[PDB]
Amino acid sequence: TDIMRNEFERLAARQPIELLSMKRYELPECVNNSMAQLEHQAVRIENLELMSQHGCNAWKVYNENLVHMIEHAQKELQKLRKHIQDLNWQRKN
């Protein structure tokens, strides 16, 4: 029960043939693509500066968050095991 998105997705799935992507930027009519590669390589060389500026701190800053989100799941797993075990214990008696 979806919008036309559903029709195009099902046609692309039954059809299976994935939609044509951007194969213009990398090859480099060619002058514009070339200047595009120039601006994009400059933007990329700028985007790798702000990564190395902080560096490995930002990765572990989210890795601590990853472990902190991980712990609550096993805590709730323990809760669920305990509740099911108490139920089975009552049924046993």
């Binding site: 060389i45 190395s52 490995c56 890795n63 799941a73 709730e76 099911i84």
Partner: protein, 50 residues
């Protein structure tokens, strides 16, 4: 193009070995989340079933 492409690809490989540990580490953490998210929902089955 080829001058800066060689620059950023070299800039990636400084970070691709830098973050590449955290990449497989975050990939390893996400595999554990997807491992539990089945059994966590498997807990939802065995609750209302029981």
């Amino acid at each position: 193009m080829t001058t800066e492409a060689k620059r950023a690809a070299k800039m990636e490989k400084k970070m691709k070995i830098l973050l590449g540990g955290y990449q497989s580490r975050a990939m390893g953490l996400m595999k554990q989340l997807n491992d539990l998210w089945d059994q966590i929902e498997q807990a939802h089955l065995e609750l209302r079933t029981f």
